[PDB]
Assembly symmetry: D2
Homo-oligomer: 327 residues x 4
Amino acid sequence: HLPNITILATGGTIAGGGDSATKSNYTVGKVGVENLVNAVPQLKDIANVKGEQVVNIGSQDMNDNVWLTLAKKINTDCDKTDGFVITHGTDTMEETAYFLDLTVKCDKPVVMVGAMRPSTSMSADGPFNLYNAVVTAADKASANRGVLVVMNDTVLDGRDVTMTNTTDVATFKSVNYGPLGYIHNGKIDYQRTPARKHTSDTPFDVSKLNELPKVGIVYNYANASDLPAKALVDAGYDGIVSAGVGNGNLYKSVFDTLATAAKTGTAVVRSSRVPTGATTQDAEVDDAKYGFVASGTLNPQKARVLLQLALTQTKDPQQIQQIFNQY
Amino acid sequence: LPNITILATGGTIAGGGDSATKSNYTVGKVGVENLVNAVPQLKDIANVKGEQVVNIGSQDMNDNVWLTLAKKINTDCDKTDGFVITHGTDTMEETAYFLDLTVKCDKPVVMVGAMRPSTSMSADGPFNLYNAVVTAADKASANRGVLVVMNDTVLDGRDVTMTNTTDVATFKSVNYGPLGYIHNGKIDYQRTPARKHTSDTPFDVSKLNELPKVGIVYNYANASDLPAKALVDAGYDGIVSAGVGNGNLYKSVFDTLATAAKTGTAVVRSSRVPTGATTQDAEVDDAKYGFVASGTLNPQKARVLLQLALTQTKDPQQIQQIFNQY
Amino acid sequence: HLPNITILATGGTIAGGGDSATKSNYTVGKVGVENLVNAVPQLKDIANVKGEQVVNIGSQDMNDNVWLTLAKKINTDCDKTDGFVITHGTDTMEETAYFLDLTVKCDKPVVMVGAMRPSTSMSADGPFNLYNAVVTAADKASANRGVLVVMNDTVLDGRDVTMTNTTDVATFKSVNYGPLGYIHNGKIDYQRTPARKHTSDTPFDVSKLNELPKVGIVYNYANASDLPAKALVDAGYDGIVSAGVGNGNLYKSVFDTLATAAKTGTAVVRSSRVPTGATTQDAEVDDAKYGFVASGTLNPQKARVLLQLALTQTKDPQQIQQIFNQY
Amino acid sequence: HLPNITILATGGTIAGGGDSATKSNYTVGKVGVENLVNAVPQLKDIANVKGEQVVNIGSQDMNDNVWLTLAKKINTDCDKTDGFVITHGTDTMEETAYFLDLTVKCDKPVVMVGAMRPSTSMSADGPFNLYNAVVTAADKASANRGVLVVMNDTVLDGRDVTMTNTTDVATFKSVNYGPLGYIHNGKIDYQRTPARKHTSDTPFDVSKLNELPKVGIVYNYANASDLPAKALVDAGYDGIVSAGVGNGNLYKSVFDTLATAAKTGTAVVRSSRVPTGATTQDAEVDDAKYGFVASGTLNPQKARVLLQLALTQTKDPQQIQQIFNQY
């Protein structure tokens, strides 16, 4: 009769700990899901919570196998529950949020949440962030909006959400298109929803996949080395994402290596190290001439999520561009 | 009127497209004199002399142009009242900090670019150039370090960065804010960078024709060690990590860089995250590994300072000292 | 054919010129619409443009009479054009946008535009602003999103759009829920639409109105005077909006005057002087008990627009609070 | 031997409390200074703290009498302590910070701090904020920087600090010139200091004053009533600050009232309701002619603070403008 709500715990600074409340030092992986739930007894006011510990890692070590395990579990257990919260490291939550946004086939709410302060800190942000994540997953209006991230009283879509600051509790922002809703006193005023296709409206199906296509990221800057790009090509990577300078521009020697790569079986996506705004067509690079794909507003690490999934469907740069214009 | 020298390097500000109402352009259509002639009002505020140093897209900016530019300004400091450098946007933030650490001229040195090509409707380059010459003309600008002047704002070389791929308002000092705003050809300076620059740095490039080799590697989920293993296999002097969150490293990359740091490669941890410090005293024992924490320097600015450090030392603790002072 | 677009000019810095190009002085409603078009020859590549001068005022002198004229004309002339651009000063464009967003029943694109620099200034922003406003009004995907403001290559909804900076060309932002779309190379990638009800989904109809209910705005600050609030009450005002401190809070003397007035026929809305975030219920003020309405994310000048309209339908606070939850 | 730090408590949300850790409802001033101090036992690691509860009000009720009390106390008590922390409400902290920044002659560190969540909240921000405020008051490097605000791990100058968001724990930002330092692991890396004159470098001497000149604030907006302005003039106010539209512009009817009043000796400052950027001279308003002062980056409530203090030395509009260009 209260919403049934599953928490899938993956680790992160929300389950991490230091030897002092008032020193910054901490390590991830100290606290199980039972202990987090128990630190918020007010959850039983809003939901019937069930917690499982899928893994316990720092999200700096998030990987393809944990992504597959999560998407598979959510997809199989969808019918058991009214929604899911995933407790997660903050460092790569914006990656896992987008991978689930594209492969989750459950249109029931799936809410990701972490903490910028360890469980042991003075003014720890984890307990209230977890409360609000359950408020969100239990809100009937949260369904059909794609996979969500809830941080600092804010409901953010999985596609546009990113980290803006290294330490600030208020780091997570949807920096191009804004947030979906604000949470106040356990109620959400939703004024937006992602137009890009997600969840059950995407062709991606990882139900029977045990690995993903290999996709690396190369940085651009003055005097950039080509050695990173060469190393990925030498290893037969399925794709490379460029964190370009400005509007996805390539240092000349990186450009040389990725042009060869795009014409010899490696997919190439131009994104940007710049934190907001689209990597666009119709600027300084004719993507189609090189066989590149322009990432749009997807940053390097998001573009790598969508490129891995595009490559389960096609190697064709025109098709990949069509997928980067729809998802 | 002061004497002001424009040193032109190319970029969108001197780039053009086939239409004022389409986004497509190539850099380097336009020479320095053409730019200057485009803004006749410069006459009202300065005696302007333009020289072309190079003509390239800043996406192709490199160690040799940096060395040329810093030598040029240091050689010619006595000869002018200040400098404006016209430059692409994409790496303006790297050139700005290189120069901020390496120019010993404490007269005004102001970088400027354009987010719209000189051909475009509502081109931003003319008023930008105009405001850059105002900044270089104001004696208040002296002793503030190398500056960037974009969208009516004066920003310090260390903190300035691009926030947006296309916005005319892209250039911000995202951690500590601007030094001043330009209104009607006057600046109200309320700020100056506390970090040591120009003649308070030990870095001199006057007889250097190259810089230590410093690469950047990106972190992300399931990150490849192969990029870092490449730079190490090549004998790179230094690698900056574009960390996740507070300068964190995927396990593979962590292992490779920890092994390199013991073989002598300098390792700085920075962050792909656009604002905030990569700090000591978080998840990574930097002293245990011989790693250096970048502070607020983003990965491309971290490279600038690591290259210069690497002209003076390979000692981690001594690199951390330099990353705490400049 | 190319779409037929109507430019309705109201004046503004965009029609306004200075004495120099390189000094900050200018007059507003200097020159006219036909002058404004002729400065942008490229418009004829994208539409068949006709201009009409409605009024010629600096938007700091904007008023109910210009609002009523604008809305009736857009609603009357709707059938014979494919879309509208309204040239307007920047200072109060956010207020006119939300009035029009509520009272226009034309669901063809309605776009507001201005300029932050004068006509004659170096790097004048008006010409490209006007070009992109016509792109937006000409796009079929612009229909049914409400009244829009198009500034600095960005499409902003009438409701959330506001000024962030006194002089920056990039001043206009939707500071709570972000923009709907970015314009690049004459094309828009819409990824958002406002969920709050607008244009033909509102019951507001000003067709037969010649004046609007009287709504004043009072400011809160340390040691605030109650004299302004008392002056609007003595004048028999229909409504009062509070620019509160923090989360909509009231200086003691303002609390006293507004609480007295809310129980004897004056509608009272708590908004905030703070530039982003909702003035919420459930905080320090029990709105229901005083007969106050919480403005949500509407800032004082926006709350005033919605309060004047709500008072054309009802004087009941619970019903005004309902309108404030829906539009 | 750790430093001696004086906490002066004035109330606010930092001292506030609600029925539930999870519900938003609260009231200010439920817990006293010693309770706040004992909730952060770790303060003994970094200082010898002495608390004095000076008043106990919501900062929505802050007033001239509390300002005078605080300035005279800090000034008298300077030589008995190494540094001051003032606990205060958030809503007007930015006003008090500025008044103290102009009236305090003690150049030892003086830090203000509050909380956006009440002390009873889950993930309450006050405890670690208070910890950080005392770190900042203990740090000698803070001396000579003017009065500070410490919130959300940031050191902010009293002049430029303002609220950005109605509820966000990260709401306090130096929105024009940025912050002075970030706090991490109990340490500050200061990279900035305000160039504007503060503390000992101002002429402002409140030592014998028991009242401050009367300064009100009137809001601009479409169709603005002249009644607020006329109410303040009728009452013989000593000055009026206008929260102008755009770059300090005034609606017709308010412009008429303020112009008439400056002619007979009322001090009139043009500020802007726009949250960032300066209200400049030499835009659309001839300040020289009307006897008006442009407020620069001072927002309306900040402008009030400096105008009241300008008015303790001069009523001469040109002398008041010179004060507005120096502080």
